[PDB]
Each structure stands twice: as C-alpha cells, then as structure tokens.
C-alpha cells in the first residue's frame, strides 16, 4: 500500500504534521480508528509524542471520545497515563472537564494519578468542581482524591464549585466533609466568593449544610 494508517509508504512512525504536530497515532485517536492505533503500536509507535499543544494520542482519544483507541492506549504499558499538555492538563483532568465518565473511571482504575495537577495547581477534582461534574467528583473522591488540595491561588475544589455556581458538586464535596474554611490567596472563603458572584444557593449550603451537629 502507498499509505497505511496515515503513514506514507516507508516514512517514520514519529513524523508530525507541520500544522498540528500530530503523528499517525494522534490521528488514529481522533478518527476512532482502533485497528490503525493497534497496528501503529505493534509497529512500536511512540504513544507519548506531543502535538503542538502538548497532547499525546491519549489526550486526543479522550477529546474525541474514541473508546476503542482509548482502551488500546491505556492497555499499552508504555503509555504515560499522566502525560501533560503545555498547560499541565492530563488525560484525567481532561476527562473530568469534558464529562466523559467512562474514561475518567477507566483511567483511575488503570492507576492514573488522581492527585496530579495542571500548571495552575489544579487537580481533576478541582476541575470537576469548576464544571460541576458530579459523577467525576464522586469517583475521584472514592479513589483517593485530596478533597482539600489547594491550587496556586490557594483555592480548594470547594472554593471553585462556589465560584462557578456548581451547586450539586459543592454538595458532594460537603458530603465528603471538605473543609469549607480554607481560603484563597485573598483570604476569601468559598462562601465569600459565592456571595461575590451571586450564588446565594451555595452561600446557604455553606452556612447550613452538613455542619458539626449545628446544621
């Protein structure tokens, strides 16, 4: 064949497009071409080469919700499950943000680091809180996620849930007894940022919900 799995006759498996910096394996992920991805890996393609934004074929599979290629990639021992994009984003954080539930759990079960963080000190749980991804929050919390971890602005996931108006996820954090007293760098409590951004429902939750025999 003149071309096989995006690779032109006799070219390197690691060659990258000028436009996106993507390799054949990145493209197999985006097109959900399970067979191509399998053949490329058997030919020893590097599953951790980064495109122009630092994404590996695994970030690409998550972004394209390609379950087939995704499975193939996480089953491949050499795949860096915690690969970071140029802003520190990992496949897990990415899965939490896009709300691709099946992948988040599969990543965690494959031992992805639940407490890894992007360049802003944000963990997958911080993000699940920010986008109000309840299911991701529950699974991360059940799997060792640090509920009170502070990012670089000293914001906890709860702080972020308060900031963004993620009512349901702030509730999950409280059901897990997250510390609602930890403030950000401006000394604001999740309650203070919730009031400032007009999420009165969350302010109420913080003042009454699941308190110490005082709720």
């Amino acid at each position: 064949a003149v071309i096989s799995d995006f690779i032109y006759q006799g070219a390197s498996l690691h060659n990258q497009t000028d436009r996106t910096g993507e390799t054949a394996l990145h493209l197999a992920a985006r097109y959900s071409r399970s067979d191509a991805a399998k053949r490329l890996l058997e030919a020893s393609a590097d599953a951790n080469i980064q495109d122009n934004m630092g994404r590996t074929p695994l970030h690409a599979a998550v972004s394209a919700d390609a379950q087939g290629v995704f499975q193939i990639l996480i089953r491949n021992r050499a795949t860096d499950l915690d690969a970071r994009m140029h802003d520190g984003t990992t496949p897990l954080i990415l899965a939490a943000r896009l709300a691709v539930e099946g992948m988040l759990e599969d990543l965690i079960n494959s031992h992805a680091d639940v407490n890894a963080v992007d360049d802003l000190g944000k963990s997958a749980l911080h993000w699940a809180a920010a986008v109000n991804n309840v299911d991701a929050a529950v699974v991360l919390l059940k799997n060792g996620a640090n509920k009170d971890m502070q990012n670089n602005r000293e914001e906890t996931p709860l702080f972020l849930a308060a900031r963004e108006g993620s009512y349901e996820t702030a509730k999950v954090l409280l059901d897990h007894f997250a510390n609602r007293d930890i403030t950000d760098h401006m000394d604001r409590l999740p309650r203070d940022i919730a009031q400032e951004r007009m999420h009165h429902d969350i302010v109420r939750l913080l003042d009454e919900y699941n308190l110490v025999r005082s709720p």
Side-chain angles (χ1 to χ4, degrees):
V2 168
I3 294 171
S4 282
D5 312 328
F6 302 98
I7 301 177
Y8 198 67
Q9 48 182 179
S12 177
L13 298 167
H14 310 307
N15 285 174
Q16 296 170 276
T17 69
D18 328 314
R19 21 287 132 96
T20 61
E22 294 175 300
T23 65
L25 192 52
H26 282 83
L27 302 180
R30 292 248 306 312
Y31 281 64
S32 302
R33 291 175 59 180
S34 301
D35 290 333
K38 208 173 302 179
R39 290 192 285 278
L40 293 172
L41 288 175
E42 289 173 57
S44 290
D46 193 333
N48 304 309
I49 290 177
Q50 297 177 292
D51 63 9
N52 289 348
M53 299 192 172
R55 298 171 293 207
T56 63
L58 177 54
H59 291 96
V62 175
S63 296
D65 188 57
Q67 297 299 318
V69 179
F70 172 77
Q71 286 300 316
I72 291 173
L73 284 176
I74 66 174
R75 270 150 44 187
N76 184 62
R77 182 187 304 274
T79 297
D80 180 6
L81 298 183
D82 308 310
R84 310 167 67 79
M85 287 172 62
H86 294 327
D87 68 347
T89 302
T90 55
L92 189 64
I93 288 176
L94 184 59
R97 297 165 70 182
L98 298 177
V100 289
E101 213 47 49
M103 298 183 158
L104 180 112
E105 305 180 53
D106 286 346
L107 275 172
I108 293 176
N109 291 326
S110 296
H111 302 164
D113 182 359
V114 298
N115 287 311
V117 298
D118 57 22
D119 297 347
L120 290 167
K122 293 180 174 176
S123 64
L125 184 58
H126 274 93
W127 282 102
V131 307
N132 195 43
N133 185 337
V134 185
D135 292 307
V138 170
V139 175
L140 287 159
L141 288 166
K142 278 277 189 172
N143 285 284
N146 180 358
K147 64 193 177 199
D148 298 320
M149 186 195 293
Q150 287 179 293
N151 56 20
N152 295 342
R153 290 148 69 194
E154 285 169 52
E155 315 169 313
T156 55
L158 183 58
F159 184 90
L160 294 184
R163 185 184 189 291
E164 304 305 313
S166 305
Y167 184 84
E168 301 62 41
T169 300
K171 191 166 188 175
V172 170
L173 283 161
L174 293 187
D175 281 343
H176 280 255
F177 305 93
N179 200 332
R180 73 192 81 190
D181 302 313
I182 301 173
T183 59
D184 67 351
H185 61 136
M186 298 292 86
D187 291 305
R188 289 173 294 188
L189 292 171
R191 179 192 181 301
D192 300 318
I193 195 63
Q195 174 173 299
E196 283 172 44
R197 301 180 70 78
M198 296 177 71
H199 302 307
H200 306 309
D201 54 326
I202 294 181
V203 177
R204 290 189 271 286
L205 191 70
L206 293 167
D207 287 328
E208 319 169 5
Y209 199 72
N210 211 29
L211 290 167
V212 291
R213 93 200 207 190
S214 175

